[PDB]
Design a protein around this ligand. Structure first.
Ligand SMILES: NC(=O)C1=CN([C@@H]2O[C@H](COP(=O)(O)OP(=O)(O)OC[C@H]3O[C@@H](n4cnc5c(N)ncnc54)[C@H](OP(=O)(O)O)[C@@H]3O)[C@@H](O)[C@H]2O)C=CC1
Ligand code: SF4
Lengths: 123, 331, 170, 340, 116, 77, 387
C-alpha cells in the first residue's frame, strides 16, 4: 500500500497558528470549489448556496477555539470529511446528515416557554 | 426525539378514554392514540400513516389486497401498525375494525366504476355504512374527506356523489369533520404528474385552461395530522388549497421546461374523446376514466367559508419550487 | 350491495367464472411457486448457511431455488447475516431495483430485531427498519431445515396470493 | 398451402418445445455431475419446470433503466431470438428433408451465425454505463474472434464436398464420416463451438463480480426469456452444425439389409420407419452432443480475457493454417479432387 | 406460398406474440427507481476487430475457390497456395511483433541493490 | 478587459455583510473597505473564478486582498 | 484524470463477504486499489468489554464464521495463559483434533469457494457436501451447526458422545478419496495453471513487511507455523509435516491448501488412535461449571455453579497476546484484564485484516479477472476484517 488515494495527504502538524490558519483557508476554498460537484453527485433536493451557507457556518462554529493542537485535530477531521465527500464514499443518505433542519420544517408546538416544555415534561 | 406531534403529554380523548404518551417521542415510543385509516394503501394513505406512525400512534390498517398492504409495515414499530382485511360490503368487518380506534379517517375514493362498484356505491353508500358504526361506537375525532368541487349538481357523477357523501356525513354522527383538499401532487401521484411525466398522447379537452392550485401531498398529510389531535376542528368544513391558482398550460410548460422535451399535444374535442374512453373499462389495469372527461371542463370552485392551512399554523409549498425534484428521473 | 359478504379468507368458488379464475390463479401462483429466484444478499455467519442450502445435502435446485445474483431477475431477497449502519442504504437500493411481485425473507436472528448485536452502535436493529419482511427465519445459525421451512411457509403464502381473484374484488 | 403450414408447426413443436426441456436437462445433468438431485418438486418426475420459469417470467414487470433507449432494448432481444430461430431452415432431417431446400445451404447456415454477434454487440450499448459498454466490447471481440475459426473450418469441410448444399454433404459422408479421419479438427471445433455460444469455460463476460451487478444488462422480464431462449437455441444450433458437417449427420449404418428382410414393398409405413431411424441417428448424435456441452461446462473454470485472445490468435489459428496447407496438399497428392 | 418464405416471415410475428404478451400481462410499469472523466484502453481491445477484417475477408476470398476446385486441377492449387503463402507470412508479422500482447507493468524490479 | 470589474461588482454585490454596495470602488479593500472576514475573502474569490469558469492556484488565490488585485489578476486568461 | 473507478461488489461479488472495493483501472490494469471494509462492522469489541468471559465466548465464533473453532480456541488459550491454569490431557487432544477438523472445514470451504469465484463449479458442491458431513460432527459434540458453544476458557464444554470417536474414523477413511478426487481436476488443469502460475507474486521480505502469515507466508518460502514454532495442545505430541511453497504466486498458496488436507487427516489418524482417558473440563470448579450430576447433591458445587453464572470467575490483572495458527493465518488476540470479571479490553488480530491491508501492494498491474483469483486466496471472508 505504497501509494495514497486521490486527495488524501500525509498528516502533518503545523507548528504555528498561522500555518494552521493558512491550511484551513485553503481547505474552505476546497469545499467551496467542490460544492457544485456535491449536488450533482449526491443528487440533493436543494440548491448550491445552501450548501455554501452551511459550509460557512460550520467553520463559524469553531472560529473561537484557542489551542493550536485542538484546532489541529479539528482540521484533520475536516480534511477527512472533505476526503469522504469528494468521492463516492459517503452515500446520499449519509450525506444528508448535515441538513436535518432543512428537509422538514419541524412540526406543530415547538416548545419555547416554560409551559410548552412543562406540558410534555420537557419532551 | 421529541413529541412534535402533540401539544402536550396527557390527553383524555373526547369519548373519555385516558391516553398518556410515555417515553420520549421516537419510533420506540408510544403515544396512545388508536387510529384507523380506511384505504391506507392509497397514495394519500401511505404518507398519512407514515407520519401517523412516526410518533407511535397505534394504527389499525384495514386492507383489501394482500400484496399492497405490505409496504406500510416499515413505518411502525411492534404493535404500532396492525393489519386486518375487510370489504366495504361486509358490515361486520367495518364493525370489527373500529372497536378500539380513538380516531379514524376514510380516504376511500375511486375515480372509475368497476363492474362491482359505482360512484353511488363507494362514496355515499359505503361512507354511510361505516360512519353508522362510528355513531354506534361513539368514536371520537371522526374525519371524512371529500374532493374539491364536491357539489350537489350533475355534470360529474363523481362530484355529484361527493357532496351526497358530505351530506350523509353531516346527517349521521353529525359532528364529523369534513376536509376537501385541492388537486394533489407527489412522487408518483395518481393521475396528475406521472400521467404528465410520460404520455404517448397527452390529449384532453378545454384547451388546457382549467384552474386550480395543487397541493403537495406531504403538506396534506401534515395538515391532516395537525387536524387529528387538537380541539377547534369539530364539524368544520375544510378547504385546503395551494398558494397560487394555475392553468394546465402553465403546469405542463413548467413540467416540460425541466424535462427539456416536447410533451405532445393533441387536445381533440369531446365527441371522439368519449367513445375511446368507453372501451377502456373492460381492461383490468386502470385507464383514464370516461367520467374523468367531465371534470376537465370543471375547475376549482373554492368555498370562501372554510378554514385554511393558516388555521393550523402551516404554509404549504409552491409547485415551481418542487418541479426539479419530482420528475427528475425522467431527464 | 349486500350488507353481508364472505371474507376473502373464507370464500369458496360458486360461479363457473370463479372456477375459471381460481384455476387460472392456481396456474399463476403455481409457476410463481415452482420457479423461484432469490438474490444472493448474504454477508456473514448467515451466508454460509445459505450456501449450505445449495450444498448437496439439502438441495434447492430440486426446489427450483437458484441464485440469480442480479436483483432485476430476482423474485425475492433473502436478507441474511447482520445488518450494519454502514451498509443499510445499499440494502434499500437493492430492494429498490426489484420487480413488483416481490417478497423479502429475514434469514437469521441478527436480521430481525438486531439479534446478538441489538445493543451495538453501528447496527440496524433488524431489517424491519428498512424493508417490509414477510417471513422471518429464526435461528442464529438458522437451520437449513428451518430456512427451507421458511421458504415453504412463504410458498404457502404464495399459494394464497390471489392475484386473479382480486380482479373480481372479492 | 395447408400441408406446409402444418409442416412448420410440427417443426416448431419439434424444436422450440424441445429447447425448454434442454434447459431442464442441463439442471438434471449438473445435478448428477455434482452428486445431487435435479428438479423434482415441480412436475411428475420434475419435468416441465421451464414452463413454470417462463410463465412466472412473463408475469414480472418491464422495469427499464433511465439510461437505456427502450426501443433498443426491444430490438436486441427480438433480433437475437429470431436470429437463432431462423437458423433452422437447412438443418437436414434425413435425406433432403429441410424446411426449405436450397443449393446454397452452408452460406445461409453461416451468415445467420454471422448475424449472431450483431445482437450481443448492440445489447450492451443500451444503459450506457462505462462498465456496461466495455463489457459488450469484451464480449463481442471474442464473439467475432472464434466466429473466424467456426467459419474457417467450414471451407475445409467442403474441400471434400465442393457443394454448398447441406444435404449433399451427408450423402457424400455415407462412405465414411469426417470426424473419424479428421480427429483433431473435432477437438478444435468443439472448443470453437462452445466459444460462439455463451458458455462458461469461455464466457468470462458474464461476471457479476466484476461489474456493478451486471451480467449483460440485467434487463429482465419477457425481455429476459428472449436472449435466454436465443442462447439455448444457439447451443443446439451449433450442435446441429457439429452434427452434419463433422459427425454422422443422419446416418447410422447401411440398414438396407434389414429392410429387405422386413418389408416387401414401399409403403407409408416404410417411409415412416426410415424417416424415424434417420431422425433418430441425427437425434442420438445431437443428444450426445448437447450433453457434452454441459460435460465440459461443469469440469472447468473460466478464463482471463488475455487468455481468451491468446487462445484465439496464437495457439489455435496458426494450426488452422497448417490445416489449410495439409488438406489441399493431401488433396493434391492423389487425384482426389471433389466434384459437385 | 413456399414454406421457406413463410418461415422467415412468421417468426417475427411469433416474436411479436412473445413481445406484446408482457405488455398485456404486466403491471406497474415504471416507478421512481460519477462518470466525469476517463476512458481506458490498450491496443489489444481495439486491434482485434480491426485485424479481424482481413482474416474474416479471406474466408470469403477462399470461398469461391472451394466450390470450383475440381476445375482448377493442379494449377488453381498452385495459385491459391501462393495466395495463402502470402497471407500466412502476413499473419506471422503480428505474432513476432506481439500485437495482441496486453503486457502488465507489474514488474518485479529487475534492478538490484546497487549501494554506496 | 473592459467592463470586467462591472461583472466583478455584480458578483460582489450579491452577498451580505456589506454596509454599502455603493462602496464597491475599483480600489476596495476586502477586509477594510468592504468589511469582510478571512472566510469572506475566499468566498468572493471562488465566486469570481466560478463567474469566469477559470481555475486558480492557491497562493494567487491567497494574496488577493483587494478588488484592485482581482482586476490585476483577471487577465491571466 | 483518474480512472473511471468502480465499485466492485455491493452484495454478491465474492461469495461469503461484502467486498466493497475501489479499483482504478487504466488498461484493465489496477494502478491502485482501495478496499473499504466496514460493511459487516458490528462493533463487537465495544460489546465484549461489557460481558463476562463466561458470556463473552460466543462473540468469537461469530468472528471468522467459516472457522469458528480456532477463534474459540485462541480465546480459550489467551484466558488459560492469563489465568495460569492447565487444561488436562484429554482436553488437549480433543481441542486439538477439533481445531484440525475445523482446518479441514476451512480449507474445504475456502478452496472450493475460490474455485467457484474463478468458475469451477464442481468443487463448490463436492466440498460443501463433505462440509455437511462435518456439520454433523460439530452437531454431536456441541450445539447445533456452524456456531459451536464450545471450548471454554476453562478448557472444554463437555465430553463427546459415546461413539463419535469411532464414527469419525469411518468418515476419515473416505475423505482421502473424496479429496484426491477434487485434486484431480484443479491441480494439473492448464486453465487453472494458466490463471494461477505467477499471479500476485509475494516476495519474502515484503511478505514480512505486510505482516502476513499462515499459508501465505509459508507459500512465499519462509517455514513458519505456530503449530511447530511455538507449539501447544500436544501438536508436539502428534507428528505433523508442514508444507512450504516456492514462488510467491497464488499457485503455491493453492497447493499448500491442498496439502494441508493431507496433513490434517494424518492429525486425525494420530488422534483417534491415541485419545486418552481423563477429565474433559478443567479439574476445579472455580473457573468452569461443576457437572450437573453432583451439584444436586453437594452444597459446595451449587455456590460455584451460581457465582460462575452470576458474577463469573475472577481473573488476575495483566495482559496477554496469544496468537495461534488459524487456517486463514496467524490469528491473534490481545486481552487486557481489569482484574474484574469483565475484560477491560480485548483486541482481536483477525488474520484477513492485514491480508486485506496488503491488497494493493500485490494487486498492482494485474487484470480485473485476475483481481478475483487474488481475492479468495487471501481469504477475505469479511467476518474477520471488520468486527
Ligand atoms: N388529487 C386527487 O387525487 C384527489 C383525491 N381525493 C380523494 O383523497 C383520497 C385519497 O387520494 P388518492 O390517494 O389519490 O386516491 P386512492 O388511491 O387512495 O383511492 C383508492 C383507495 O381507496 C380504496 N378503495 C377504493 N374503493 C374501495 C373499496 N370498495 N373497497 C376498499 N377500498 C377501496 C382503495 O383500496 P386499495 O388499496 O385496495 O386500492 C385505495 O386504498 C381519495 O378518497 C380521493 O377521492 C380528494 C381531492 C384530490
Ligand atoms: S443470525 Fe447469528 S450467525 Fe447470523 S448474523 Fe445473526 S448472530 Fe451472526
Amino acid at each position: 500500500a505504497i501509494i495514497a488515494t486521490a486527495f488524501a495527504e500525509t498528516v502533518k502538524f503545523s507548528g504555528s497558528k498561522q500555518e494552521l490558519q493558512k491550511r484551513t483557508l485553503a481547505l474552505y476554498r476546497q469545499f467551496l470549489r467542490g460544492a457544485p460537484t456535491f449536488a450533482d453527485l449526491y443528487e440533493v433536493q436543494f440548491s448550491i448556496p445552501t450548501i455554501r451557507t452551511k459550509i460557512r457556518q460550520e467553520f463559524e462554529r469553531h472560529r473561537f477555539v484557542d489551542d493550536l493542537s485542538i484546532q489541529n485535530v479539528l482540521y484533520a477531521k475536516g480534511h477527512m470529511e472533505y476526503q469522504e465527500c469528494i468521492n463516492f464514499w459517503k452515500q446520499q443518505a449519509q450525506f444528508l446528515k448535515y441538513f436535518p433542519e432543512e428537509d422538514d420544517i419541524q412540526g406543530r408546538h415547538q416548545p419555547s416557554n416554560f409551559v410548552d416544555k412543562f406540558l410534555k415534561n420537557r419532551a | 426525539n421529541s413529541f412534535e406531534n402533540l401539544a402536550q403529554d396527557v390527553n383524555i380523548t373526547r369519548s373519555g378514554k385516558t391516553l398518556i404518551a410515555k417515553g420520549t417521542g421516537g419510533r420506540s415510543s408510544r403515544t396512545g392514540y388508536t387510529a384507523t385509516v380506511f384505504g391506507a394503501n392509497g397514495f394519500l394513505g401511505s404518507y398519512l400513516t407514515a407520519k401517523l406512525a412516526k410518533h407511535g400512534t397505534t394504527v389499525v390498517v384495514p386492507y383489501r389486497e394482500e400484496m399492497a398492504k405490505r409496504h406500510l409495515k416499515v413505518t411502525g414499530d411492534l404493535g404500532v401498525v396492525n393489519f386486518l382485511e375487510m370489504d366495504l360490503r361486509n358490515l361486520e368487518s367495518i364493525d370489527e375494525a373500529v372497536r378500539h380506534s380513538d380516531i379514524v379517517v376514510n380516504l376511500i375514493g375511486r375515480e372509475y366504476e368497476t363492474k362491482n362498484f359505482n360512484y353511488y356505491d363507494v362514496h355515499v353508500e359505503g361512507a354511510r355504512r361505516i360512519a353508522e358504526a362510528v355513531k354506534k361506537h361513539n368514536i371520537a375525532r371522526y374525519i371524512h374527506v371529500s374532493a374539491f368541487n364536491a357539489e350537489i349538481d350533475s355534470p360529474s357523477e363523481f362530484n355529484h356523489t361527493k357532496g351526497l357523501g358530505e351530506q350523509v356525513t353531516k346527517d349521521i354522527v353529525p359532528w364529523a369533520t369534513i376536509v376537501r383538499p385541492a388537486p394533489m401532487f407527489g412522487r408518483e401521484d395518481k393521475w396528475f404528474l406521472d400521467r404528465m411525466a410520460r404520455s404517448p398522447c397527452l390529449v384532453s379537452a378545454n384547451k388546457f385552461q382549467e384552474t386550480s392550485n395543487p397541493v403537495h401531498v406531504i403538506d396534506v398529510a401534515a395538515a391532516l395530522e395537525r387536524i387529528c389531535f387538537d380541539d377547534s376542528t369539530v364539524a368544520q368544513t375544510f378547504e385546503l388549497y395551494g398558494p397560487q391558482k394555475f392553468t394546465q398550460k402553465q403546469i405542463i410548460d413548467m413540467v416540460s421546461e425541466t424535462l427539456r422535451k416536447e410533451v405532445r399535444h393533441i387536445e381533440l374535442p369531446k365527441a371522439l374523446y368519449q367513445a375511446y374512453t368507453k372501451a377502456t373499462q373492460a381492461i383490468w389495469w386502470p385507464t383514464y376514466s370516461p367520467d374523468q372527461v367531465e371534470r376537465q371542463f370543471l375547475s376549482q370552485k373554492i368555498d370562501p367559508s372554510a378554514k385554511t392551512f393558516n388555521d393550523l399554523d402551516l404554509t404549504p409549498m409552491e409547485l415551481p419550487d418542487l418541479m426539479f425534484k419530482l420528475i427528475r428521473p425522467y431527464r | 350491495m349486500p350488507t353481508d359478504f364472505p371474507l376473502p379468507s373464507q370464500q369458496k368458488p360458486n360461479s363457473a367464472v370463479d372456477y375459471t379464475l381460481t384455476t387460472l390463479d392456481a396456474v399463476a401462483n403455481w409457476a410463481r411457486q415452482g420457479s423461484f429466484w432469490p438474490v444472493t444478499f448474504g454477508l456473514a455467519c448467515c451466508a454460509v448457511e445459505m450456501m449450505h442450502v445449495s450444498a448437496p445435502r439439502y438441495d434447492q435446485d430440486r426446489l427450483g431455488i437458484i441464485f440469480r445474483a442480479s436483483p432485476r431477475q430476482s423474485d425475492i431477497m433473502i436478507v441474511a447475516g447482520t445488518l450494519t449502519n454502514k451498509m443499510a442504504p445499499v440494502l434499500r437500493q437493492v430492494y429498490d431495483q426489484m420487480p413488483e411481485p416481490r417478497w423479502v425473507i429475514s434469514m437469521g436472528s441478527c436480521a430481525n430485531g438486531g439479534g446478538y448485536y441489538h445493543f451495538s452502535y453501528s447496527v440496524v436493529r433488524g431489517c424491519d427498519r428498512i424493508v417490509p419482511v414477510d417471513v422471518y427465519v429464526p435461528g442464529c445459525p438458522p437451520t437449513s431445515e428451518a430456512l427451507m421451512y421458511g421458504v415453504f411457509q412463504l410458498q404457502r403464502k404464495m399459494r394464497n396470493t390471489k392475484i386473479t381473484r382480486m380482479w373480481y374484488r372479492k | 398451402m395447408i400441408i406446409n403450414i402444418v409442416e412448420i408447426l410440427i417443426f416448431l413443436v419439434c424444436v422450440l418445445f424441445s429447447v425448454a426441456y434442454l434447459t431442464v436437462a442441463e439442471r438434471k445433468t449438473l445435478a448428477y455431475m455434482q452428486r445431487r438431485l435435479g428438479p423434482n418438486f415441480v412436475g411428475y418426475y420434475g419435468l416441465l419446470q421451464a414452463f413454470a420459469d417462463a410463465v412466472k417470467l412473463l408475469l414480472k414487470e418491464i422495469v427499464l433503466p433511465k439510461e437505456s433507449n427502450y426501443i433498443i432494448l426491444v430490438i436486441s432481444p427480438l433480433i437475437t431470438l429470431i436470429t437463432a430461430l431462423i437458423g433452422w431452415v437447412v438443418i437436414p432431417l434425413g435425406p433432403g428433408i429441410t424446411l426449405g431446400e436450397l443449393n446454397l445451404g452452408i452460406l445461409f447456415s453461416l451468415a445467420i451465425g454471422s448475424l449472431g454477434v450483431f445482437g450481443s454487440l448492440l445489447s450492451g450499448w443500451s444503459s450506457n454505463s462505462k462498465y456496461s459498454l466495455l463489457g459488450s466490447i469484451r464480449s463481442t471481440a471474442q464473439l467475432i474472434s472464434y466466429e473466424l475459426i467456426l467459419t474457417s473450418i467450414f471451407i475445409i469441410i467442403i474441400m471434400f464436398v465442393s457443394s454448398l448444399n447441406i444435404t449433399t454433404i451427408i450423402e457424400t459422408q455415407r462412405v465414411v464420416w469426417y470426424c473419424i479421419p479428421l480427429l483433431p479438427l473435432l477437438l478444435i471445433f468443439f472448443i470453437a463451438s462452445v466459444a460462439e455460444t455463451a458458455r462458461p469455460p469461455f464466457d468470462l463476460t458474464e461476471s457479476e463480480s466484476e461489474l456493478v451487478a451486471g451480467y449483460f444488462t440485467e434487463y429482465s422480464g419477457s425481455p429476459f426469456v428472449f436472449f435466454f431462449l436465443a442462447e439455448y437455441s444457439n447451443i443446439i444450433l451449433i450442435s446441429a452444425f457439429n452434427g452434419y458437417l463433422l459427425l454422422g449427420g443422419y446416418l447410422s449404418f447401411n440398414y438396407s439389409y434389414l429392410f429387405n428382410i422386413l418389408f416387401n414393398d414401399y409403403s407409408y409405413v416404410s417411409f415412416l420407419f426410415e424417416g424415424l431411424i434417420n431422425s433418430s441417428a441425427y437425434a442420438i448424435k445431437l443428444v450426445f452432443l448437447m450433453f457434452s456441452f454441459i460435460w465440459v461446462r461443469a469440469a472447468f473454470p473460466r478464463f482471463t480475457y488475455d487468455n481468451l485472445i491468446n487462445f484465439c490468435w496464437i495457439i489455435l489459428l496458426p494450426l488452422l493454417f497448417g490445416i489449410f496447407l495439409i488438406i489441399p496438399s493431401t488433396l493434391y497428392i492423389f487425384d482426389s479432387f471433389p466434384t459437385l | 406460398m413456399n414454406t421457406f418464405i413463410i418461415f422467415i416471415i412468421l417468426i417475427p410475428i411469433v416474436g411479436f406474440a412473445l413481445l406484446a404478451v408482457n405488455i398485456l400481462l404486466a403491471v406497474y410499469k415504471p416507478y421512481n427507481e460519477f462518470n466525469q472523466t476517463r476512458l481506458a484502453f490498450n491496443a489489444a481491445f481495439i486491434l482485434v476487430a480491426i485485424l479481424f477484417l482481413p482474416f474474416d475477408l479471406e474466408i470469403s476470398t477462399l470461398l469461391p475457390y472451394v466450390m470450383s476446385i475440381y476445375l482448377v486441377s493442379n494449377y488453381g492449387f498452385t495459385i491459391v497456395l501462393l495466395f495463402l503463402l502470402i497471407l500466412i507470412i502476413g499473419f506471422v508479422y503480428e505474432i513476432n511483433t506481439n500485437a495482441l500482447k496486453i503486457n502488465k507493468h507489474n514488474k518485479p524490479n529487475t534492478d538490484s541493490l546497487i549501494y554506496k | 478587459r473592459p467592463d470586467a470589474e462591472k461583472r466583478i461588482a455584480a458578483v460582489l454585490e450579491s452577498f451580505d455583510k456589506i454596509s454599502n454596495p455603493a462602496a464597491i470602488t475599483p480600489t476596495a479593500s476586502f477586509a477594510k473597505d468592504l468589511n469582510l472576514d478571512s472566510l469572506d475573502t475566499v468566498e468572493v474569490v471562488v465566486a469570481i473564478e466560478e463567474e469566469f469558469g477559470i481555475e486558480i492556484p492557491d497562493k494567487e488565490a491567497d494574496e488577493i486582498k483587494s478588488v484592485n488585485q482581482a482586476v490585476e489578476y483577471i487577465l491571466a486568461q | 484524470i483518474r480512472a473511471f473507478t468502480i465499485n466492485f461488489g455491493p452484495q454478491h461479488p465474492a461469495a461469503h463477504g461484502v467486498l466493497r472495493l475501489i479499483l482504478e483501472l487504466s488498461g484493465e490494469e489496477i494502478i491502485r486499489s482501495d478496499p473499504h471494509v466496514g460493511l459487516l462492522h458490528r462493533g463487537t469489541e465495544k460489546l465484549i468489554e461489557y460481558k463476562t468471559y463466561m458470556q463473552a465466548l460466543p462473540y468469537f465464533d461469530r468472528l471468522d464464521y467459516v472457522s469458528m473453532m480456532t477463534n474459540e480456541q485462541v480465546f480459550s488459550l489467551a484466558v488459560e495463559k492469563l489465568l495460569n491454569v492447565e487444561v488436562p490431557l484429554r482436553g488437549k487432544y480433543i481441542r486439538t483434533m477439533f481445531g484440525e477438523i475445523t482446518r479441514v472445514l476451512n480449507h474445504l470451504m475456502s478452496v472450493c469457494s475460490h474455485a467457484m469465484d474463478v468458475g469451477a463449479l464442481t468443487p463448490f458442491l463436492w466440498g460443501f457436501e463433505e462440509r455437511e458431513k462435518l456439520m454433523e460432527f460439530y452437531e454431536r459434540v456441541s450445539g447445533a451447526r456452524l456456531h459451536a458453544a464450545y471450548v471454554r476458557p476453562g478448557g472444554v464444554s463437555q465430553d463427546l458422545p459415546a461413539g463419535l470417536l469411532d464414527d469419525i474414523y469411518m468418515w476419515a477413511t473416505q475423505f482421502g478419496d473424496r479429496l484426491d478426487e477434487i485434486e484431480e481436476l484443479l491441480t494439473d488443469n492448464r486453465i487453472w495453471k494458466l490463471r494461477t502460475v505467477n499471479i500476485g507474486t509475494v516476495t519474502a521480505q515484503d511478505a514480512l513487511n505486510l505482516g502476513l502469515s499462515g499459508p501465505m507466508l509459508r507459500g512465499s518460502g519462509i517455514p513458519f507455523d505456530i503449530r511447530k514454532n511455538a507449539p501447544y495442545d500436544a501438536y508436539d505430541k502428534v507428528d505433523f509435516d508442514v508444507p512450504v511453497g516456492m514462488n510467491g504466486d497464488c499457485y503455491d498458496r493453492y497447493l499448500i491448501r491442498m496439502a494441508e488436507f493431507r496433513q490434517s487427516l494424518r492429525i486425525i489418524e494420530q488422534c483417534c488412535n491415541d485419545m486418552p482417558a481423563g477429565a474433559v473440563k478443567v479439574e476445579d470448579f472455580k473457573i468452569n461449571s461443576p457437572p450437573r450430576n453432583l451439584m444436586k447433591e453437594d452444597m459446595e458445587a451449587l455456590i460455584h455453579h451460581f457465582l460462575l453464572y452470576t458474577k463469573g470467575y475472577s481473573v488476575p490483572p495483566g495482559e496477554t497476546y496469544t496468537a495461534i495458527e488459524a487456517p486463514k493465518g496467524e490469528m491473534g488476540v490481545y486481552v487486557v484484564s481489569d482484574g474484574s470479571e469483565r475484560p477491560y479490553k480485548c483486541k482481536i488480530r483477525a488474520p484477513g485484516f492485514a491480508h486485506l491491508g496488503a491488497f494493493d501492494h500485490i494487486a498492482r498491474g494485474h487484470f480485473l479477472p485476475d483481481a478475483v483469483a487474488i481475492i479468495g486466496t487471501m481469504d477475505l471472508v469479511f467476518g474477520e476484517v471488520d468486527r
